[PDB]
Amino acid sequence: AMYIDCDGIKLNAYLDMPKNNPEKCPLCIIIHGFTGHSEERHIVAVQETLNEIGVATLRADMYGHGKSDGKFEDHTLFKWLTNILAVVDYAKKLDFVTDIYMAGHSQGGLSVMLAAAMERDIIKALIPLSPAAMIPEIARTGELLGLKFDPENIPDELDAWDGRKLKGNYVRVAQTIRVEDFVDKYTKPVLIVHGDQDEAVPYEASVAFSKQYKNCKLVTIPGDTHCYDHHLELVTEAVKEFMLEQIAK
Amino acid sequence: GAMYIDCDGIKLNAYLDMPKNNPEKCPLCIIIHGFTGHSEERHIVAVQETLNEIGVATLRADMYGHGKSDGKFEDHTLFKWLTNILAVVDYAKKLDFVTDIYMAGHSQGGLSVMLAAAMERDIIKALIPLSPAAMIPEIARTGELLGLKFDPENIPDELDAWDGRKLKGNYVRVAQTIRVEDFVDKYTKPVLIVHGDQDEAVPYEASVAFSKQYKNCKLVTIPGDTHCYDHHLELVTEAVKEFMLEQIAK
Numbered sequence A: 001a002m003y004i005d006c007d008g009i010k011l012n013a014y015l016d017m018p019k020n021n022p023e024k025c026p027l028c029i030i031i032h033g034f035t036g037h038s039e040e041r042h043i044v045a046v047q048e049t050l051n052e053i054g055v056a057t058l059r060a061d062m063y064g065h066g067k068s069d070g071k072f073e074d075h076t077l078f079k080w081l082t083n084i085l086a087v088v089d090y091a092k093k094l095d096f097v098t099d100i101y102m103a104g105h106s107q108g109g110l111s112v113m114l115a116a117a118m119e120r121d122i123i124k125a126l127i128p129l130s131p132a133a134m135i136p137e138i139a140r141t142g143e144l145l146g147l148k149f150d151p152e153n154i155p156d157e158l159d160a161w162d163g164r165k166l167k168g169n170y171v172r173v174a175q176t177i178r179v180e181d182f183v184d185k186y187t188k189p190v191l192i193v194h195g196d197q198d199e200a201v202p203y204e205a206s207v208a209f210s211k212q213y214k215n216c217k218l219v220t221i222p223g224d225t226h227c228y229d230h231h232l233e234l235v236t237e238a239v240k241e242f243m244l245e246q247i248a249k
Numbered sequence B: 001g002a003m004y005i006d007c008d009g010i011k012l013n014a015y016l017d018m019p020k021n022n023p024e025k026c027p028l029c030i031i032i033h034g035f036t037g038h039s040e041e042r043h044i045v046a047v048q049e050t051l052n053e054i055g056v057a058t059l060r061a062d063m064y065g066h067g068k069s070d071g072k073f074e075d076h077t078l079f080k081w082l083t084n085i086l087a088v089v090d091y092a093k094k095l096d097f098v099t100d101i102y103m104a105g106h107s108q109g110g111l112s113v114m115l116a117a118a119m120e121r122d123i124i125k126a127l128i129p130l131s132p133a134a135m136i137p138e139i140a141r142t143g144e145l146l147g148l149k150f151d152p153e154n155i156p157d158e159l160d161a162w163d164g165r166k167l168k169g170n171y172v173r174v175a176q177t178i179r180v181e182d183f184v185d186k187y188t189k190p191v192l193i194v195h196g197d198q199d200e201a202v203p204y205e206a207s208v209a210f211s212k213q214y215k216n217c218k219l220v221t222i223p224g225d226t227h228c229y230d231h232h233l234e235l236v237t238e239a240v241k242e243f244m245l246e247q248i249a250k
């Protein structure tokens, strides 16, 4: 448990080492989704699985989320991207760190897709877990996570997601992002994981992205939901097999 | 007045100057300086005073790592600047006297207003990029920023900038992502581009191309002039004047 500073916004994070406390291991940065945080069941499961195969984990609470600074309503993808650059720059100064990996769920899955492209030289492999990768396009077309609006007259505030508020700025920012450019720029190995009864983010976009990527493996979680209600073990298993593969090379 | 606008704990220094008049209700132009610049530079002040003279309030703002605002120069990126601009807009929209909101900006601030205006396209009435540095994302993509050559695929941790300044490589990683042409396409209200045709820092011809891409843009060339209009600043202000009186008359 610590704080990484990002322009005065404290980002809360958890560095978990393998039990053996090795002097050298790789690091995976893990990013939760919209209204999420680093202690969610699926985040912890992935983190624990990694730790048992020798990968340190750095789970970071993004702007306005978890125990980080900022209000939820003020968060945007530019801020999240800025935070991720700050967490990478922090990881780069850790002595124990050999290679750096990225994983993340939903909005956090999208965010690591963006952020690995931007850090393409640095990030050895990428794990988007049910990435909300259509957020930008659907924003341009007038919806955000179930809520609709005129994409040319964005409201000042959107109220939804169980008592939360969100400034229209979120939408103004998301609309600018061309996700496909980021996908074309990251040619290193990608595992996308996705449940095919996902209610929140549609399975079929992940199929479309797995194919755009130069080197992407798509693992389907049969019958499963957005946060893997039914089969989280199938996700942890997927991540385990992929990463054993990657740390061997 | 002078004031600080909070942007997530980063204080942004700004100047609100009224048309004096008052008046009771009037338009407001946001004015954004360029890379290593600030709100008290000659060319910025001059444009500011001209607007004030024809009835438009001005809100000049220092961006992250610049002028009197918080943060280090080497830590600024275009995403920080844009985020800063949306906080300035959010502040402006709360001012009771404000009728219409315009944007203007010089060089990197010219680029920033091209981007921000598209993002705020329902709010911003007209747009004035002054010698906009709108090639920055393209030359970041090619590894040719600041008289340097670097691999755009293996960006250095730190680049040397103007006059002993440093610039982190994050600046580049962020700039490579921005497709200026998308933002140009999305802003279909009146634009006035101004550019001097002996511009040392930012090639004139790029502004020709952008001016044709925009649905409604007038380009005013300043023949013989430099990046900061060392010779014919008069012409810039006169250009801004006539465009704006015309926009006020609509």
Ligand SMILES: COc1cc(/C=C/C(=O)O)ccc1O
Pocket (backbone or CB within 6 Å): A032, A033, A034, A035, A105, A106, A107, A108, A132, A145, A146, A160, A161, A162, A200, A201
């Ligand atoms: C559909 O309602 C919701 C969707 C999400 C999605 C989060 C994400 O994609 O990261 C979060 C909270 C909600 O209440």
Ligand SMILES: COc1cc(/C=C/C(=O)O)ccc1O
Pocket (backbone or CB within 6 Å): B033, B034, B035, B036, B037, B106, B107, B108, B109, B133, B136, B139, B144, B145, B146, B147, B201, B202
């Ligand atoms: C960051 O690299 C550059 C920045 C600028 C911006 C200049 C300005 O805003 O005055 C111009 C040329 C460059 O190569």
